[PDB]
Design a protein around this ligand. Structure first.
Ligand SMILES: [Zn+2]
Ligand SMILES: [Zn+2]
Lengths: 259, 259
C-alpha cells in the first residue's frame, strides 16, 4: 500500500520514489531571496473577495487539517495579481513546527516562521478542482506566514474545534468561518510558478506568498501540535513538522508586487 | 458519478468534457496514409518475446474485455523497433464493430478492419504501470488488425470463455494462454507517438501497428458481439462498436519499418 508522511522513512527526502516529479523543474516551496526577487511594476494588486465565503467542515486528513468551503459558486474568490480569470477557494490548511522557530514551508532570506497558512483556489476555467490540478494554471495558493506574537482573534474559532478532530479521519461541522480574519493588512506579495507541497506534488500552482505575516499566540500554535497524524487506536504520532523544506528554484523568477 | 462509453451522449465526441486532452496534439488512433507514412531505415526490427507469457484472468470491464498477465518479471516483453529499453506485457484486449466492415481504431488508407487487438506494455524504467502512464514513453501498444476470413485457432480459447464474462465486472481464471497465437507471420510495422484510445486518453503511448492483419472467422467476431457493456440486472446494451475513430495526426510522423 502507498503511504507518505513527514517521518524518517516516508518523509520529503523519499517522496521521489512514488512521485518522481519531486525532482521536477517547478517544485515548491522555495526560499525567497529578497535581493534577487525583483519588483515587477506590471504586477497588479491582488483582489481577495471573501465576503460571501461559506465554510462547511473541518477535517484531519492525517497530514494536516482542512477547512473546506462551498466552491459551487464564486462565493470566495481570488482575482487579479498574477492571475487571469477567477479562482475559487476550496479549502485552507496550515503547516507548522514542533518549535516556534520552524514550521513554514516558504522561507524569506532563509528565515522560517512558526507556521504557514495555505488558502487553496482553483481556476473556474477547468470546471472542477480535479481537472484544474491537471493544468499549469489550475491552482492559486495564497500563502501567509504565521509569526508567534499576539493572539489572532480570527484564528480562535479554528483552535477551539481542534480537540474534536484529534486523529486521522475525524471531521466536524464548521460553518460561518470568516477567512478574512486570517489575512494581514497588506496584500503585498511575491509570486512564482510552482507545485503542490505534498504528494502528488503536481506543478499546477501559481504561488502568491504575502510579505506581511499574521501574528499567532504561542498558545494557539501549541494547540495545533496536539493533533495526531495517526488514526484512533494507533500509536500516537503528534502532528508536528508537517512542512516540506525549500526546493531548488531552478530557472524560475520570483517577482515582487512591491518595492 | 463519472461515466463514459460509445453511445450517443457519452461517446467519443463527448469525451473532451471530462477529459480535455481529447483535443490534444498526440491523440490516437489515426489513419495511416501509406503515401505519407515513409520507410525509416533507422528503425530496428521488433523483438517480441512471449515464450514465457503467463496469463492470469479475463475480465469484462464494461468497455472491452482484458486478458491480464503477470508482469512481475520480464516473462513477456517487447523490445527493439522504435523502443528504448524493455516493455512488459500487462494485458491485451480488442475493439470491434457491429458489422464485419468496421471495428478497428487505426485505419490504413481509410480502410477499416473488423476488429483490432491491442497488446499493452509498460516501460520497466518507470517501476510500475501507474508511473509509466505518466510519461510520454511510458507505454508501448502493439496493434494488430483482425480481417474476417479463416478462423484463427489461437483465438478460440478466448472465444470459448466469453459466455462466462458476459456482463460488466465479470471475470474468470484464464491461465496458460499463448499470445503468440494472435500474431501474424510478419512483424513489419508502422509507429507514431500517441495516446490511450479510451479515457483518460493519456499521451503516453508509442504505437506499433503491424502491417499484416490476422484472420478471424465471421463466427469468432460474432461471439465478441454477444458481450454486454452493462452490468448484470441492467438493460442489455450489446458490446459492439467500442472503437474510437481516427483523430487528427497534427504534425506527427508515422514511420514504416518496411519498404
Ligand atoms: Zn499547504
Ligand atoms: Zn485498445
Amino acid at each position: 500500500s502507498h503511504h507518505w508522511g513527514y517521518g524518517k522513512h516516508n518523509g520529503p527526502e523519499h517522496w521521489h520514489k512514488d512521485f518522481p516529479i519531486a525532482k521536477g523543474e517547478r517544485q515548491s516551496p522555495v526560499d525567497i531571496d529578497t535581493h534577487t526577487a525583483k519588483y515587477d511594476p506590471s504586477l497588479k494588486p491582488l483582489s481577495v473577495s471573501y465576503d460571501q465565503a461559506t465554510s462547511l467542515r473541518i477535517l484531519n486528513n492525517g497530514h494536516a487539517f482542512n477547512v473546506e468551503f462551498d466552491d459551487s459558486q464564486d462565493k470566495a474568490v481570488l482575482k487579479g495579481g498574477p492571475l487571469d480569470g477567477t479562482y475559487r477557494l476550496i479549502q485552507f490548511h496550515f503547516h507548522w513546527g514542533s518549535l516556534d522557530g520552524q514550521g513554514s514551508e516558504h522561507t524569506v532570506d532563509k528565515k522560517k516562521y512558526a507556521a504557514e497558512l495555505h488558502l487553496v483556489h482553483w481556476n473556474t476555467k477547468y470546471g472542477d478542482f480535479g481537472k484544474a490540478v491537471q493544468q499549469p494554471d489550475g491552482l492559486a495558493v495564497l500563502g501567509i506566514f504565521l509569526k508567534v506574537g499576539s493572539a489572532k482573534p480570527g484564528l480562535q474559532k479554528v483552535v477551539d474545534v481542534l480537540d474534536s478532530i484529534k486523529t486521522k479521519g475525524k471531521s466536524a461541522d464548521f460553518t460561518n468561518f470568516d477567512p478574512r480574519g486570517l489575512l494581514p493588512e497588506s496584500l503585498d506579495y511575491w509570486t512564482y510558478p510552482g507545485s503542490l507541497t505534498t504528494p502528488p506534488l503536481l506543478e499546477c500552482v501559481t504561488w502568491i506568498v504575502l510579505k506581511e505575516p499574521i501574528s499567532v499566540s504561542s498558545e494557539q500554535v501549541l494547540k495545533f501540535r496536539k493533533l495526531n497524524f495517526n488514526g484512533e487506536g494507533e500509536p500516537e504520532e503528534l502532528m508536528v513538522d508537517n512542512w516540506r523544506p525549500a526546493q531548488p528554484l531552478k530557472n524560475r523568477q520570483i517577482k515582487a508586487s512591491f518595492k
